[PDB]
Design a protein around this ligand. Structure first.
Ligand code: HEM
Length: 180
Protein backbone atom coordinates (compact mmCIF):
# COMPACT_ATOMS: atom_id res chain seq x y z
CA UNK A 1 0.00 0.00 0.00
CA UNK A 2 1.66 3.10 -1.36
CA UNK A 3 0.90 6.67 -0.52
CA UNK A 4 -1.77 8.34 -2.61
CA UNK A 5 -0.68 10.06 -5.82
CA UNK A 6 -3.59 12.52 -5.59
CA UNK A 7 -2.68 14.67 -2.64
CA UNK A 8 -2.24 18.40 -3.26
CA UNK A 9 -1.82 21.28 -0.82
CA UNK A 10 -4.43 23.86 -0.24
CA UNK A 11 -3.77 27.01 -2.27
CA UNK A 12 -3.65 30.38 -0.58
CA UNK A 13 -2.72 28.80 2.70
CA UNK A 14 -0.94 31.28 4.81
CA UNK A 15 2.40 29.61 5.50
CA UNK A 16 2.65 31.90 8.57
CA UNK A 17 -0.22 30.01 10.18
CA UNK A 18 1.60 26.75 9.65
CA UNK A 19 5.23 27.50 10.48
CA UNK A 20 4.18 28.81 13.91
CA UNK A 21 4.89 27.47 17.37
CA UNK A 22 4.55 23.82 18.15
CA UNK A 23 2.01 21.39 16.81
CA UNK A 24 0.52 18.33 18.58
CA UNK A 25 -1.18 15.61 16.60
CA UNK A 26 -4.63 15.40 18.15
CA UNK A 27 -6.01 12.91 15.63
CA UNK A 28 -4.40 10.63 13.09
CA UNK A 29 -5.48 8.33 10.31
CA UNK A 30 -3.17 5.74 8.92
CA UNK A 31 -4.58 4.03 5.87
CA UNK A 32 -2.38 0.89 6.38
CA UNK A 33 -4.38 -1.58 8.58
CA UNK A 34 -1.32 -3.77 9.10
CA UNK A 35 -0.08 -1.45 11.83
CA UNK A 36 -0.73 -2.07 15.51
CA UNK A 37 1.12 0.63 17.39
CA UNK A 38 -0.44 3.98 18.07
CA UNK A 39 1.65 7.08 18.43
CA UNK A 40 1.65 10.53 19.79
CA UNK A 41 3.64 13.17 17.97
CA UNK A 42 4.60 16.84 18.38
CA UNK A 43 6.78 18.99 16.16
CA UNK A 44 7.99 22.53 15.63
CA UNK A 45 8.36 23.56 12.02
CA UNK A 46 10.22 26.64 10.88
CA UNK A 47 10.74 28.26 7.55
CA UNK A 48 13.12 30.85 6.14
CA UNK A 49 13.31 31.93 2.52
CA UNK A 50 11.87 28.68 1.33
CA UNK A 51 13.87 26.30 3.53
CA UNK A 52 11.98 24.31 6.10
CA UNK A 53 13.56 22.76 9.18
CA UNK A 54 11.57 21.04 11.92
CA UNK A 55 12.14 19.26 15.17
CA UNK A 56 10.04 16.16 15.50
CA UNK A 57 9.02 13.88 18.37
CA UNK A 58 7.22 10.52 18.42
CA UNK A 59 5.98 8.49 21.40
CA UNK A 60 4.92 4.95 20.72
CA UNK A 61 1.99 4.54 23.14
CA UNK A 62 2.02 0.70 22.83
CA UNK A 63 5.79 0.13 23.34
CA UNK A 64 6.30 3.16 25.64
CA UNK A 65 9.33 4.40 23.72
CA UNK A 66 10.17 7.61 21.93
CA UNK A 67 12.40 9.00 19.21
CA UNK A 68 13.44 12.40 17.93
CA UNK A 69 14.22 13.71 14.50
CA UNK A 70 15.20 16.87 12.69
CA UNK A 71 13.76 17.20 9.18
CA UNK A 72 14.82 19.69 6.50
CA UNK A 73 13.73 20.38 2.99
CA UNK A 74 12.55 23.03 0.55
CA UNK A 75 9.15 24.43 0.00
CA UNK A 76 7.55 23.55 -3.26
CA UNK A 77 6.81 26.45 -5.51
CA UNK A 78 3.34 25.04 -6.11
CA UNK A 79 1.88 25.34 -2.65
CA UNK A 80 2.49 24.50 1.05
CA UNK A 81 4.34 21.22 0.69
CA UNK A 82 7.87 19.92 1.25
CA UNK A 83 9.87 16.70 1.03
CA UNK A 84 12.30 16.44 3.91
CA UNK A 85 15.37 14.49 4.67
CA UNK A 86 15.72 13.69 8.33
CA UNK A 87 18.35 12.94 10.94
CA UNK A 88 17.88 11.14 14.14
CA UNK A 89 18.71 13.03 17.27
CA UNK A 90 18.55 12.59 21.01
CA UNK A 91 16.40 14.59 23.32
CA UNK A 92 19.13 17.30 23.50
CA UNK A 93 19.14 17.49 19.69
CA UNK A 94 22.57 15.95 19.36
CA UNK A 95 22.85 13.97 16.17
CA UNK A 96 22.72 10.15 16.51
CA UNK A 97 22.44 9.30 12.85
CA UNK A 98 22.84 11.66 9.94
CA UNK A 99 20.11 11.58 7.29
CA UNK A 100 19.81 8.39 5.15
CA UNK A 101 19.34 9.99 1.71
CA UNK A 102 17.22 7.02 0.60
CA UNK A 103 14.59 8.02 3.14
CA UNK A 104 12.29 11.05 3.05
CA UNK A 105 8.89 12.29 4.01
CA UNK A 106 6.63 14.53 2.04
CA UNK A 107 4.35 16.76 4.10
CA UNK A 108 1.44 18.45 2.42
CA UNK A 109 -0.58 21.08 4.28
CA UNK A 110 -4.32 20.73 3.60
CA UNK A 111 -5.53 23.43 5.98
CA UNK A 112 -4.06 25.73 8.59
CA UNK A 113 -5.45 28.45 10.79
CA UNK A 114 -4.40 30.10 14.06
CA UNK A 115 -5.32 27.15 16.22
CA UNK A 116 -5.25 24.06 14.02
CA UNK A 117 -4.02 22.35 10.88
CA UNK A 118 -4.50 19.25 8.75
CA UNK A 119 -1.57 17.68 7.02
CA UNK A 120 -0.82 14.59 4.98
CA UNK A 121 2.53 12.81 5.43
CA UNK A 122 4.05 10.21 3.14
CA UNK A 123 7.06 8.62 4.83
CA UNK A 124 9.34 6.64 2.50
CA UNK A 125 12.18 4.43 3.60
CA UNK A 126 14.10 3.35 0.50
CA UNK A 127 11.70 1.34 -1.75
CA UNK A 128 8.81 1.23 0.76
CA UNK A 129 6.14 3.83 1.72
CA UNK A 130 4.52 3.89 5.18
CA UNK A 131 1.18 4.53 3.49
CA UNK A 132 -0.95 7.64 3.78
CA UNK A 133 -0.89 9.34 7.18
CA UNK A 134 -3.27 12.23 7.89
CA UNK A 135 -2.76 14.20 11.09
CA UNK A 136 -5.02 16.84 12.61
CA UNK A 137 -2.77 19.31 14.52
CA UNK A 138 -3.44 21.84 17.25
CA UNK A 139 -1.16 24.09 19.23
CA UNK A 140 -2.63 23.08 22.54
CA UNK A 141 -2.49 19.39 23.21
CA UNK A 142 -5.80 17.72 23.72
CA UNK A 143 -7.56 20.76 22.25
CA UNK A 144 -10.24 20.34 19.62
CA UNK A 145 -9.41 21.35 16.03
CA UNK A 146 -11.26 24.26 14.61
CA UNK A 147 -14.35 23.95 12.51
CA UNK A 148 -12.29 24.99 9.47
CA UNK A 149 -9.83 22.16 10.10
CA UNK A 150 -12.66 19.70 10.67
CA UNK A 151 -14.20 20.74 7.39
CA UNK A 152 -10.86 20.10 5.66
CA UNK A 153 -10.91 16.52 6.92
CA UNK A 154 -14.25 15.88 5.29
CA UNK A 155 -13.19 17.67 2.12
CA UNK A 156 -10.05 15.44 2.02
CA UNK A 157 -12.55 12.57 1.59
CA UNK A 158 -12.15 11.34 5.11
CA UNK A 159 -14.23 10.94 8.20
CA UNK A 160 -13.04 12.24 11.53
CA UNK A 161 -14.79 9.34 13.24
CA UNK A 162 -12.16 7.04 11.70
CA UNK A 163 -9.17 8.90 13.24
CA UNK A 164 -7.42 7.87 16.38
CA UNK A 165 -7.63 10.49 19.08
CA UNK A 166 -4.36 10.89 20.85
CA UNK A 167 -5.63 12.68 23.99
CA UNK A 168 -6.72 9.29 25.42
CA UNK A 169 -3.56 7.27 24.64
CA UNK A 170 -1.54 8.02 27.78
CA UNK A 171 1.01 9.96 25.72
CA UNK A 172 4.32 11.01 27.26
CA UNK A 173 5.63 14.20 25.60
CA UNK A 174 8.81 16.14 25.68
CA UNK A 175 7.63 19.78 25.67
CA UNK A 176 11.25 20.90 26.35
CA UNK A 177 12.29 19.53 22.96
CA UNK A 178 9.47 21.28 20.96
CA UNK A 179 9.69 24.74 22.57
CA UNK A 180 11.32 27.44 20.29
C1 HEM B 1 0.43 10.55 15.49
C2 HEM B 1 0.99 10.88 14.36
C3 HEM B 1 2.02 9.91 13.76
C4 HEM B 1 2.04 8.58 13.62
C5 HEM B 1 0.96 7.60 13.98
C6 HEM B 1 3.25 8.16 13.01
C7 HEM B 1 3.70 6.90 12.78
C8 HEM B 1 5.01 6.56 12.52
C9 HEM B 1 5.60 5.24 12.54
C10 HEM B 1 4.76 3.95 12.73
C11 HEM B 1 6.89 5.33 12.33
C12 HEM B 1 7.89 4.16 12.26
C13 HEM B 1 8.57 4.01 10.91
C14 HEM B 1 9.45 2.78 10.93
O1 HEM B 1 9.23 1.89 11.78
O2 HEM B 1 10.41 2.72 10.10
C15 HEM B 1 7.21 6.71 12.18
C16 HEM B 1 8.44 7.23 11.97
C17 HEM B 1 8.62 8.47 11.45
N1 HEM B 1 7.68 9.50 11.25
FE1 HEM B 1 5.79 9.38 11.97
N2 HEM B 1 3.97 9.27 12.75
C18 HEM B 1 3.25 10.38 13.18
C19 HEM B 1 3.63 11.69 13.03
C20 HEM B 1 4.65 12.15 12.21
C21 HEM B 1 4.86 13.51 11.77
C22 HEM B 1 3.93 14.65 12.16
C23 HEM B 1 5.94 13.48 10.98
C24 HEM B 1 6.63 14.61 10.19
C25 HEM B 1 6.44 15.91 10.51
C26 HEM B 1 6.49 12.14 10.93
C27 HEM B 1 7.65 11.75 10.33
C28 HEM B 1 8.27 10.60 10.66
C29 HEM B 1 9.66 10.32 10.49
C30 HEM B 1 10.69 11.24 9.87
C31 HEM B 1 9.90 8.95 11.00
C32 HEM B 1 11.27 8.28 11.14
C33 HEM B 1 11.56 7.26 10.08
C34 HEM B 1 12.89 6.56 10.31
O3 HEM B 1 13.19 6.28 11.50
O4 HEM B 1 13.59 6.31 9.28
N3 HEM B 1 5.65 11.37 11.68
N4 HEM B 1 6.04 7.42 12.32
Amino acid sequence: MDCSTNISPKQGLDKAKYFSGKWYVTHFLDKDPQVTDQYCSSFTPRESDGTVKEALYHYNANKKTSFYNIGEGKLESSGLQYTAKYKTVDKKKAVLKEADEKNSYTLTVLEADDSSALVHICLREGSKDLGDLYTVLTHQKDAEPSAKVKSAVTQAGLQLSQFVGTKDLGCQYDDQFTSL
